[PDB]
Ligand binder design. Structure first.
Ligand SMILES: CCCCCCCCCCC(CCCCCCCCCC)(CO[C@H]1O[C@@H](CO)[C@H](O[C@@H]2O[C@@H](CO)[C@H](O)[C@@H](O)[C@@H]2O)[C@@H](O)[C@@H]1O)CO[C@H]1O[C@@H](CO)[C@H](O[C@@H]2O[C@@H](CO)[C@H](O)[C@@H](O)[C@@H]2O)[C@@H](O)[C@H]1O
Ligand SMILES: CCCCCCCCCCCCCCCCCCCC(=O)O[C@H](COC(=O)CCCCCCCCCCCCCC)COP(=O)(O)OCCN
Ligand SMILES: [Fe+3]
Lengths: 60, 75, 487, 488, 126, 122, 48
C-alpha cells in the first residue's frame, strides 16, 4: 500500500493538473450515449490502482 | 422617500446573498457580483416603474376605446 | 413626525437585519431583536402622545396603491379603538423575546425573526382601513404561528394542534372571503369609509353578517368552536401562548367592532339576542368547566373564554358604557392573562410539569413568585383597584340598560370566576410541600422580576385612574354607537 | 419584399439558430480530434443565448408586429395578446433551459438533440400563439406534440421513460384526431377556416332558430381535444403517469410551456366559438371536476412528482373557472392565474431538480431538510404555501381574483367548490411542510449543494412570490390590456 | 471486521470525537461523544445516545449499549445517562460546529502563496 | 464478560433470485432490509429510508411458510403497499416488506428469498 | 425654563392640523366614490 501513496505524493504540478482533469472527465459515465455513438470510453491507466491493493483483487 | 433605485438595489443584494446561501456558501462570497446584483436590481426596478406608467396609459386609452364602442349601441 | 409607516417598517428592518447574521453570534441576534422590539414600543408610545381625541376621522392616514385603478389600496389609519391594540401588540413582543432569553441558544435566529414577522403582521391588522387587505393580514398570521407551534412545540402533539388550528382558521377565512368578494362586487370598492356610507339591502345584511360571524367567532371562541384553543394553547411555548391569548384572541372582537357593529346596523340589532344567548351560556359553561381541569395552562386558557365572551356582551349593548367598557376589558385581559401565562411559564421552565397535583407549598420556597402570582389572581377575579373590574363593571352597566336578564346571567361569571381563580392559587401556592415529587426550587430571577414590573404598574394604573384611557376613546366610540341612527 | 418579413424575424432567428446548433452538435459530437466531446452543456448555453436574442428581437419590435398584416392575414394574426403571450413563453423556455443545465453534467446526459428539440418546440409554440386559423393551429399543435413525444422517451434505458413516452404519444394522437374531426365538421358546415370568417358566420345565428348539428358537434369535439391537451378531468387518462415517468427537466417544461400556448388557442377560439355559451357549460363541469379530483387525489400521494402532477390538474381547474365565466374580468383572472401558476411551477420544479441530484423520490425523503439545508426548506415551504393560496403570498392573488370573476358572473356553485378544494389543497400542502420541520426521522438524507443557475432562479422566484402583493399593479395592467385586445 | 459486518468507518450525525482518538473500522451511531485517547478497534459498535469516557479502550467486536456511559482501559460500564445529558449531547456538536465555522472564515478560497513561489523563482531566474 | 457485537448478530439465509443461497449477517433491532443491504443483495440507493411511507416495495422479500409465524402480522399499510406494486394486484400470501421486519434473536437461521429487481430510478 | 412649558410647546407642534385632516377626509370620500362609479361602469362592459 505504500507504493501508491509514494507515487501520488511525488507528482509534479503538470501531472497533478492532468490527473485532476482526467478524474473530472471520467467521474460520471453515460453508457447509453456511448452505445449510440458506437464508442467505449475506458478509464485511463493513470486512474487505475493495482489489483493487489483492492479488497479481493478485482480485475474488472 | 422609498425610490425605485434603493428598493431595486436592496432586492439585488438580497437575491445575491440568497443565491449564495442556497449553495451553502458564505453570504459575501464574491463581492463583485453583489455589486453587479445591486446595479441590476436598481435598473430592473426603474425599468419596471417606467413600463408600469406606460402600461397604465395604454390601458386607459384602450378602455376609452371600448367604452366609446359600447356607447354606440344607444344610437 | 411619527407616522404609521415607521412603526410598521421598524419590525421589517429588525427581521431583515437578523436574517443575514451568522447563527454563531447568538448574543448579537438577541440584542438586535430586543432593541428592535423596544424601539417599536417607544414608537407606539410616541404615537399615543400625538393622538387627537376630538375627531372621529381616522388619523395618521397613509395610502399605497394596490390595484392599478386604485379600487383597492393600502389604507392605514388608527382611531380611538385600535390605538391601544397597536400599543399592546407592540408592548407584548419585547416581553416574549425576554421570555426565551436563557434558552435562546437552541431556538436560534428563526425565533426572533418569527416573532418580529408576527409583530409586523399584527400591527398592520389593527391599522388597515381596507376590508380586503384587512383579510390579507388577518390570515397572514397563520404561517408564523404555524411555524411557532410546530417547530418549537413541547411534545409530538404539536402536529395535531397545528393542523386543527390551521383547518379551523382556513374554514372561517374562506367563508369570510366570499362575503368580502360579494361586498366588493356590489359596492365597487373595499374602503371602510366608503363601505360605511353605502346602504345595504336588508336581505344581504343577514347573509353577509353570518359569513363575517363565521370567521370572527372562531377567533373569539363562542361555544361550538372553542376546542382548538385549549389544545393549540397548551401545545405552545411560553412566549407562544402570550401571543395567542394576548393578541390573537383580540382579532375576533376587533373585527366585530370595526366591520360588523357599524357595516350593518340593522343586522346587528336583529342578531343581538343571538349573541346574548351564546355569550351567556359560554360564560356559564366555560367558567364551570374550568373547575374540573387539572392542567395549569388549560385552566387559565379557560379563564380567557369566559372573559372574552363577556366582552361580546359589551360590544353588542351599543352604548358608551358597553362598547367603551368592553375595550378596557380586552386591554386588561391582554395584560392579566398574558401575565398569568408568564407565571405558569416560570413554573414550567424550572419543573417540567403542568399538573396541579405536583405543585403545592410554593409559598414557603418561592415567596416573590407567590406574591406576584396572587396579585394577578386578584386581577383575574375582577377585584376593584385592578384593570379588570373597571371593564367588567362597565360592561354590566352597559348591558343592564338594554336587557336585565343578560346582565344577571353575565353577573354569575364573576361568581364562578372568583371560584377557580382562588382555588387554583390555594392548590399551587398554599399548602404543604411535597419533597417526594419535587425538592429543588429557585424564586424569580432578575428577568422575571423586571418582566412582571410593567404588568404590575400597567394593571393598577388602569385600575385606579382609567380616565387616561377612557377620555381618548369617547369621541371615537360614541360615533360607533350610532351609525344608522339620526336622532 | 424583404420588409414583409419584419413580422417573422423572431421566428426566423430561432429557426436558423436551431439549425446552426444542430449542425454544430452533429459535426463536433462525432469528431476524432476532440475525442467525441459530450457537448450538451455547450449547446444548452448557446440555445439559451439564442432564446435571449430572439426575446430581444421580439420585445423590441413591438410596433412592427402588425406590419404587412394584410399579406400575412391568411397565415397568422399578430396583436397585443400574441406579443405578451409570446414574450412570456420565451421567458418560461429560457427558465427551463437554465434549470436543466445541472442535469447534463451530474447525471451525464450528453445528448445535445434535447436542446434542439426544445428550441423546435418553442418555434412551434410561437407559431401556435399567433395562429389565427384551424390549419395553422393544428400544425403548430402537432409540431410541439412530436417535439415532446421525442424528448419524453429520451431516457431509452429507463423503464418509466419509454412507457411514459408511449402513453403520451397515444393520448396526444387520440386527442389530435378528435380535434381534427371537430375541425373537419366545422369546415364542412360553414365552409370557412379563418377565425374572422368563422366568427362572422357564427355570431349571428346564436342557435336562435335551430341548432346546427354539425357546428355544435365540431365545437364540442374541438373543446374535448383541447381539454385533453391541458389534461382536465375526465381527460387526464395518463397525465400523472406521464409526469412521473418523464425526466424531471422534461417534466418541468411540459408543465409550463404547453399550457400557455394551448390556453392562448382556447382564448382565440372563444373569441369566435361562443356558440350559445356551449363551451361555458363544458368548461364549468370540467373545472369543477378538475378541482375536486385534484384535491381528493393529491392527498393520497407519497411521491413528489405525482403530487406536483395532481397540483397541476387542480390549478388547471382553477384557471378553467375563468373560462366558465365569459367576461373581461374572467379572462383577466385566467391570465393572472396562468402567470402565477407558471412562476410557482418553475419554482417548485427548480427545487425538485435541486434535490433530484441525490435521487429524491418520496416526500419522506425530504424529512430532515430543515436541519441540513435550513434555507432550501424555507423556500420549498414558501412555494407550497403559494400553491395553497395563503393570503400573504402571491398564490393567493390568483385564486382571489378567479373567485371574484366567478362570483361576478353569478356562478355561486363554483365559489363553494373552489373554497372546499382550497381547504383540501392547503391541508395536503402544509402536510409537506410538516415533514420538513416538525418530524424527526431516524435516518437522514444529505443533498449536495445546488448550482448557480437554479440558485438565482429560486432566489428571484421566491422574492417574487413573497413580495408580489406589495407591487401587483403591472401584472394587472398588462393582463387587462391583453384581455381587451382579444376583441379590439 | 471480525464481527462480519462491513468494515467501513462510519461516523453518523452529531458525533463528537475527542482528540487522540484512533478509529479503525468502527461504526458510531448518531449523537455520541468519544473521549480523548479513546481507541475504537475493528468492528466495534457504539450505539446511539451514548458517551465514551476519556482514555477508554474497547477491543475489537465490543459494543457500547445505547444510553450508557463507558470508560476504562478494558472499557466497562459506569452508569446510565440521564435525560438532560442525552439531550445535551447534540448541543455540544452544534457548539463545536459553530467554533469550526468561526475558524472557517479565516481562509479565502485561494491562498496567496503562489506569489511567494514566483518571487522565489525570480530570485533564481525561472 | 463484556457487551459483544456478536451478542446481537442474527444469522440469516438469503437467496438471490437465481437460486444461490448465501448467508448474510444482521443486527437484532434493525430492519431485515438493512441486513440485506450489508452484503449488497438489495441496492441501498433504492430504499435509503427505512420508513413505510417512503416505500414502494423495493424491499419485498419471501419468507418461508414455517418461519412466518414468528413475525408480527402484516399491517394494513404493508398490505396496501404490497398490492399496488405487485404488477398484478394479487397477494402472494407469504411475501413481507423488508423495511417492516425487525430482526430478533428468535429469528436465528431464518430463510428469506429475494425476488427479482425492479426499476426505481424515477 | 421649566420642563412643562417646553413639553407643551413641543406637543402642540407635533399634533396634526385639524382643518386639513377633515378636508383630506372629505376629498378622499369624493374621489373614492367617483372612482367607484367609474369602476362599476367599467365592469359593466361586455366581453364582446
Ligand atoms: C416588490 C417591492 C415592494 C416595494 C413597493 C412598495 C415601496 C414603495 C416604492 C414604490 C415605487 C417603486 C416600485 C418598486 C418596484 C419593485 C421592484 C421590482 C423588482 C426590482 C428588482 C413606485 O410606486 C409608485 O409608482 C407610481 C407610478 O409612477 C404609482 O403611482 C400611480 O401612478 C399612476 C399610473 O400612471 C396611477 O394612475 C396613479 O394612481 C398613481 O399616481 C404607484 O405605483 C406608486 O405611487 C416608488 O416610486 C418610484 O417610481 C417613481 C414614482 O412614480 C419615481 O420616479 C418617477 O419617474 C417618472 C415615472 O416613470 C416620473 O416622471 C417622475 O416624476 C418620477 O420621479 C421614483 O423616483 C420612485 O419614487
Ligand atoms: C422578480 C422578483 C425580484 C427578484 C430580484 C431581481 C433582482 C435583479 C436581478 C439580480 C440578479 C443578481 C445576479 C448577480 C450577477 C451574478 C451572475 C453571474 C452568473 C455567471 O457568472 O455566469 C455563470 C452562470 O450563469 C448564470 O448563473 C445565469 C443564471 C440565469 C438564470 C435565469 C436566466 C434567465 C431566465 C429568464 C428569467 C427567469 C424566468 C422568468 C420568467 C457562472 O458560472 P459558475 O461560475 O457559477 O459555474 C457554472 C454554473 N453554471
Ligand atoms: Fe420498504
Amino acid at each position: 500500500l505504500a507504493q501508491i501513496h509514494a507515487s501520488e505524493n511525488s507528482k509534479s504540478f503538470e501531472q497533478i493538473e492532468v490527473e485532476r482533469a482526467l478524474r473530472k472527465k471520467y467521474a460520471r459515465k453515460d453508457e447509453d450515449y456511448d452505445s449510440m455513438l458506437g464508442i467505449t470510453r475506458e478509464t485511463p491507466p493513470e486512474l487505475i490502482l493495482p489489483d493487489n491493493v483492492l479488497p479481493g483483487g478485482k480485475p474488472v | 422617500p422609498i425610490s425605485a433605485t434603493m428598493v431595486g438595489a436592496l432586492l439585488g443584494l438580497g437575491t445575491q446573498m440568497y443565491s449564495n446561501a442556497l449553495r451553502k456558501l458564505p453570504y459575501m462570497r464574491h463581492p463583485w457580483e453583489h455589486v453587479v446584483g445591486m446595479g441590476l436590481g436598481a435598473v430592473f426596478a426603474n425599468q419596471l416603474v417606467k413600463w408600469d406608467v406606460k402600461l397604465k396609459e395604454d390601458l386607459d386609452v384602450m378602455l376609452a376605446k371600448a367604452r366609446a364602442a359600447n356607447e354606440r349601441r344607444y344610437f | 413626525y411619527f407616522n404609521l409607516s415607521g412603526l410598521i417598517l421598524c419590525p421589517v428592518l429588525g427581521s431583515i437585519i437578523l436574517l443575514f447574521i451568522p447563527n454563531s453570534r447568538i448574543r448579537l441576534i438577541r440584542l438586535i431583536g430586543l432593541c428592535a422590539s423596544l424601539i417599536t414600543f417607544l414608537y407606539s408610545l410616541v404615537l399615543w402622545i400625538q393622538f387627537d381625541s376630538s375627531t372621529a376621522k381616522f388619523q395618521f392616514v397613509e395610502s399605497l396603491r394596490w390595484l392599478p385603478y386604485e379600487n383597492i389600496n393600502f389604507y392605514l389609519g388608527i382611531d380611538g379603538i385600535s390605538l391601544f391594540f397597536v400599543i399592546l401588540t407592540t408592548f407584548l413582543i419585547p416581553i416574549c423575546i425576554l421570555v426565551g432569553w436563557s434558552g435562546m441558544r437552541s431556538y436560534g435566529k428563526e425565533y426572533i425573526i418569527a416573532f418580529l414577522i408576527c409583530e409586523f403582521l399584527m400591527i398592520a391588522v389593527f391599522c388597515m382601513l381596507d376590508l380586503l387587505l384587512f383579510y390579507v393580514f388577518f390570515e397572514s398570521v397563520l404561517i408564523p404561528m404555524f411555524i411557532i407551534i410546530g417547530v418549537w412545540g413541547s411534545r409530538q402533539r404539536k402536529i395535531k394542534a397545528a393542523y386543527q388550528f390551521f383547518l379551523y382558521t382556513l374554514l372561517g377565512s374562506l367563508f369570510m372571503l366570499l362575503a368580502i368578494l360579494l361586498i366588493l362586487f356590489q359596492t365597487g370598492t373595499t374602503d371602510l369609509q366608503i363601505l360605511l356610507t353605502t346602504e345595504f339591502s336588508e336581505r344581504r345584511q343577514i347573509f353577509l353578517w353570518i359569513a363575517f360571524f363565521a370567521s370572527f367567532a372562531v377567533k373569539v371562541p363562542m361555544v361550538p368552536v372553542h376546542i382548538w384553543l385549549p389544545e393549540a394553547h397548551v401545545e405552545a411555548p411560553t412566549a407562544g401562548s402570550v401571543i395567542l391569548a394576548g393578541i390573537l384572541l383580540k382579532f375576533g372582537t376587533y373585527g366585530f367592532l370595526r366591520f360588523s357593529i357599524p357595516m350593518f346596523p340593522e343586522a346587528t340589532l336583529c342578531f343581538t339576542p343571538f349573541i346574548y344567548t351564546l355569550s351567556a351560556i359560554a360564560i356559564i359553561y366555560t367558567s364551570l368547566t374550568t373547575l374540573r381541569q387539572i392542567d395549569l395552562k388549560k385552566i387559565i386558557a379557560y379563564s380567557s373564554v369566559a372573559h372574552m365572551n363577556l366582552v361580546t356582551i359589551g360590544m353588542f349593548s351599543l352604548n358608551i358604557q358597553g362598547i367603551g367598557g368592553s375595550i378596557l376589558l380586552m386591554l386588561s385581559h391582554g395584560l392579566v392573562s398574558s401575565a398569568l401565562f408568564l407565571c405558569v411559564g416560570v413554573l414550567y421552565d424550572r419543573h417540567k410539569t403542568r399538573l396541579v397535583r405536583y405543585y403545592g407549598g410554593l409559598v414557603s420556597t418561592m415567596p416573590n413568585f407567590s406574591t406576584i402570582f396572587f396579585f394577578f389572581t386578584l386581577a383575574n377575579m375582577s377585584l376593584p383597584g385592578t384593570s379588570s373590574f373597571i371593564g367588567e363593571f362597565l360592561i354590566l352597566v352597559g348591558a343592564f340598560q338594554r336587557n336585565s336578564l343578560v346582565a344577571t346571567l353575565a353577573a354569575l361569571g364573576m361568581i364562578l370566576g372568583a371560584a377557580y381563580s382562588l382555588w387554583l392559587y390555594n392548590r399551587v401556592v398554599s399548602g404543604n410541600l411535597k419533597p417526594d415529587f419535587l425538592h429543588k426550587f429557585s424564586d424569580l430571577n432578575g428577568r422575571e422580576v423586571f418582566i412582571f414590573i410593567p404588568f404590575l404598574v400597567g394593571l393598577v394604573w388602569m385600575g385606579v385612574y382609567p380616565k387616561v384611557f377612557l377620555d381618548c376613546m369617547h369621541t371615537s366610540v360614541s360615533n360607533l354607537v350610532q351609525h344608522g341612527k339620526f336622532h | 419584399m424583404f420588409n414583409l418579413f419584419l413580422a417573422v424575424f423572431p421566428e426566423i432567428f430561432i429557426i436558423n439558430a436551431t439549425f446552426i446548433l444542430l449542425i454544430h452538435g452533429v459535426v463536433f459530437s462525432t469528431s476524432k480530434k476532440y475525442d467525441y466531446p459530450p457537448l450538451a452543456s455547450n449547446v444548452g448555453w448557446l440555445g439559451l443565448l439564442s432564446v435571449l436574442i430572439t426575446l430581444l428581437l421580439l420585445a423590441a419590435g413591438a410596433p412592427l408586429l402588425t406590419i404587412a398584416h394584410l399579406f400575412w392575414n391568411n397565415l397568422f394574426r399578430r396583436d397585443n395578446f400574441t406579443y405578451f403571450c409570446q414574450i412570456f413563453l420565451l421567458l418560461s423556455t429560457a427558465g427551463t433551459i437554465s434549470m436543466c443545465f445541472d442535469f447534463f453534467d451530474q447525471e451525464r446526459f450528453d445528448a445535445f438533440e434535447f436542446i434542439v428539440l426544445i428550441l423546435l418546440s418553442t418555434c412551434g409554440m410561437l407559431f401556435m400563439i399567433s395562429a389565427y386559423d384551424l390549419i395553422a393551429m393544428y400544425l403548430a399543435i402537432e409540431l410541439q406534440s412530436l417535439c415532446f413525444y421525442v424528448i419524453a422517451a429520451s431516457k431509452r434505458k429507463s423503464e418509466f421513460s419509454t412507457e411514459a413516452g408511449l402513453k403520451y404519444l397515444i393520448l396526444g394522437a387520440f386527442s389530435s384526431g378528435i380535434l381534427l374531426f371537430g375541425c373537419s365538421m366545422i369546415y364542412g358546415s360553414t365552409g370557412a377556416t379563418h377565425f374572422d370568417q368563422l366568427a362572422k358566420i357564427l355570431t349571428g345565428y346564436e342557435i336562435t332558430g335551430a341548432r346546427s348539428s354539425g357546428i355544435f358537434m365540431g365545437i364540442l369535439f374541438i373543446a374535448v381535444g383541447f381539454l385533453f391537451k391541458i389534461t382536465a378531468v375526465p381527460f387526464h387518462m395518463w397525465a400523472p403517469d406521464i409526469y412521473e415517468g418523464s425526466p424531471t427537466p422534461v417534466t418541468a417544461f411540459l408543465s409550463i410551456a404547453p399550457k400557455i400556448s394551448i390556453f392562448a388557442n382556447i382564448l382565440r377560439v372563444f373569441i369566435y366559438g361562443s356558440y350559445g355559451a356551449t363551451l361555458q357549460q363544458i368548461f364549468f363541469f370540467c373545472s369543477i371536476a378538475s378541482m375536486i379530483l385534484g384535491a381528493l387525489a393529491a392527498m393520497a400521494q407519497t411521491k413528489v412528482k405525482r403530487l406536483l402532477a395532481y397540483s397541476s390538474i387542480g390549478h388547471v381547474g382553477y384557471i378553467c373557472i375563468g373560462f366558465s365565466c365569459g367576461t373581461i374580468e374572467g379572462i383577466q383572472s385566467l391570465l393572472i392565474g396562468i402567470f402565477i401558476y407558471a412562476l410557482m411551477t418553475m419554482d417548485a420544479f427548480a427545487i425538485v431538480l435541486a434535490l433530484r441530484q441525490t435521487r429524491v423520490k418520496y416526500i419522506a425523503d425530504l424529512g430532515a431538510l430543515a436541519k441540513t439545508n435550513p434555507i432550501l426548506a424555507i423556500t420549498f415551504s414558501i412555494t407550497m404555501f403559494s400553491y395553497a393560496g395563503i393570503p400573504p403570498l402571491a398564490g393567493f392573488c390568483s385564486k382571489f381574483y378567479l373567485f371574484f370573476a366567478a362570483l361576478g358572473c353569478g356562478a355561486y356553485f363554483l365559489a363553494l367548490v373552489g373554497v372546499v378544494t382550497s381547504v383540501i389543497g392547503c391541508f395536503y400542502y402544509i402536510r409537506l411542510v410538516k415533514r420538513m420541520f416538525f418530524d424527526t426521522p431516524r435516518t437522514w438524507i444529505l443533498y449536495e449543494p445546488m448550482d448557480r443557475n437554479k440558485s438565482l432562479l429560486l432566489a428571484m422566484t421566491s422574492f417574487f412570490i413573497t413580495l408580489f402583493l406589495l407591487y401587483p399593479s403591472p401584472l394587472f395592467s398588462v393582463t387587462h390590456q391583453m384581455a381587451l385586445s382579444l376583441y379590439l | 471486521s471480525p464481527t462480519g459486518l462491513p468494515a467501513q468507518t462510519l461516523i453518523d450525525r452529531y458525533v463528537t470525537v475527542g482528540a487522540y482518538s484512533l478509529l479503525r473500522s468502527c461504526t458510531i451511531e448518531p449523537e455520541c461523544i468519544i473521549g480523548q485517547h479513546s481507541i475504537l478497534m475493528e468492528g466495534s459498535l457504539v450505539e446511539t445516545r451514548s458517551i465514551l469516557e476519556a482514555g477508554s479502550v474497547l477491543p475489537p467486536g465490543r459494543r457500547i449499549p445505547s444510553g450508557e456511559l463507558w470508560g476504562g482501559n478494558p472499557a466497562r460500564f459506569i452508569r446510565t445517562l440521564t435525560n438532560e445529558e442525552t439531550l445535551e449531547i447534540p448541543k455540544l456538536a452544534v457548539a463545536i460546529n459553530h467554533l469550526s465555522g468561526d475558524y472557517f472564515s479565516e481562509f479565502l478560497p485561494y491562498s496567496t502563496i503562489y506569489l511567494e513561489v514566483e518571487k522565489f523563482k525570480k530570485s533564481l531566474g525561472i | 464478560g463484556s457487551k459483544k457485537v456478536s451478542d446481537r448478530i442474527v444469522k440469516l439465509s438469503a437467496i438471490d433470485p437465481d437460486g444461490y443461497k448465501q448467508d448474510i449477517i444482521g443486527l437484532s433491532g434493525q430492519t431485515l432490509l438493512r441486513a440485506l443491504t450489508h452484503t449488497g443483495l438489495i441496492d441501498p440507493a433504492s430504499h435509503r429510508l427505512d420508513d413505510i411511507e417512503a416505500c414502494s416495495a423495493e424491499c419485498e422479500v419471501q419468507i418461508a411458510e414455517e418461519w412466518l409465524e414468528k413475525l408480527p402480522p402484516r399491517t394494513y399499510d404493508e398490505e396496501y403497499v404490497l398490492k399496488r406494486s405487485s404488477r398484478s394486484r394479487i397477494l402472494n400470501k407469504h411475501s413481507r416488506l423488508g423495511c417492516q421486519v425487525v430482526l430478533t434473536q428468535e429469528l436465528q437461521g431464518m430463510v428469506v428469498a429475494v425476488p427479482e429487481a425492479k426499476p426505481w430510478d424515477i | 425654563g421649566f420642563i412643562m412649558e417646553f413639553a407643551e410647546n413641543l406637543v402642540l407642534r407635533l399634533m396634526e392640523n385639524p382643518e386639513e385632516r377633515d378636508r383630506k377626509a372629505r376629498e378622499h370620500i369624493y374621489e373614492m366614490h367617483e372612482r367607484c362609479k367609474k369602476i362599476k361602469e367599467m365592469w359593466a362592459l361586455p366581453i364582446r
